[PDB]
Amino acid sequence: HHHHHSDLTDAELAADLAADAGKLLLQVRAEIGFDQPWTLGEAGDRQANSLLLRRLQAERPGDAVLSEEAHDDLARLKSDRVWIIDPLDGTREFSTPGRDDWAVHIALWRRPEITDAAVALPARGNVVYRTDTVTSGAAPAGVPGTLRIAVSATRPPAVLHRIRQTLAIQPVSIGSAGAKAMAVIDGYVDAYLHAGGQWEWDSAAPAGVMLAAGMHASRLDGSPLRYNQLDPYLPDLLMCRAEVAPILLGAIADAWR
Template identity: 55%
Template sequence: MATRLAHEAGALLLDVRRRDGGHLDAASLRAAGDRSAQEFLAAALASARPADAVLSEEAADDLARLEAERVWIIDPLDGTKEYAEGRSDWAVHVALWERGELAAGAVALPGRAVTLSTDPAPEVPSTRRGSDEQPWRIAVSRSRAPAVAENVARVLPAELVPMGSAGYKVASVVLGEADGYVHAGGQYQWDSAAPVAVARAAGLHASRLDGSPLRYNDANPYLPDLLVARPELADALLAASSGSATDPAPAVRSHT
């Protein structure tokens, strides 16, 4: 279900961009995409899994999910800026949390006609990177690569590769186009739940920057930092990232 819904929401978003991209400004196109994908996913989940709770970036959170055994954690459009710019590095996230753990997930990359899922789990390609001639590639934010990533690049050494959405950056590691993804400075659970589920299914390392576990369906959805990496690179990245400051957790969003 996660795979199907992520794929279908992605197809819908492509239709919205084709239909409205020529006459809406960037802000309006981003809003139209967010709204269309949220409405589709909310209706599909309500119909197919009415007893399950949902945590979405684009919907109010009444915290009823904290009493639920199954919670869908979704980001209907991850990378709205890239989406509105006509780029391909945006994604749709659909994950299922069940009894304390991520149980399933899918990340659609509609701009590339690719959907990655926990079932079947992707196979991460082998790589020959890690030398002076071909350094490790670390995916980072297009707009603000964190200072910790700059430190990682010096220590390994590594090449920093700017990309759009969080889901796309994790997907780049799964697809073998990057070797790790380092993020600090603020994210929410919907930014990483589905990508982390897919990355773990593929055998990749996924944790906080200090190596501690990523926890989902907490009352405060803020989850400020993330490290996803090839297993052979994880220890080096954790060491280079250790002691890095992250943003203090903001207050829980208003639940209205």
């Protein structure tokens, strides 16, 4: 009784879903193994999605759900509450022996902000980053005047090449969006930069955690990340320590001179 003021809070549920899906993914990895990476990744995407949809229907039956692994009936556009989930972020990484840079993303959009969210990194001790416990005021623990930026693409974007002419940057290759964003939270890198396209579920939970931590999350041009859009595709993003946002936004802006 009287457990939450206006049964888990939305943040507690996000964290519990992320952890539960994380545990299931670890079970799938062990059961199926690594000999057929395609099969392994398919099973992870499918089984984590099934768990998350089952539990969201049981525990939040009134909420809409936008999942990478389910059809999108657009009822969410009428809803004031939408879960935006990536049941397995970094499917290729999950499918590769020894890789721990893959994630589960659970975000709640409320009409609008990402108000509650969790990112699990299941292979990293099933650590779950969550908007109700993550802390701010983190510290630059490396060399002054240089930036470490998490990136991951088939091929680096032109904007990165441009800003490297002006700023000392070491790109840090990390799998999945969630692992790159949590590297910022951890202080392992200063920033996470992506251009060239991404879906809402790749960034909604990381952005929620980033903003709850007092850090910066925006489009490359500095405008807010928008969610629950008809087309749930985001052309680009910057997530970073608050202190380096002006430096990087400025460099990106200058890159287009």
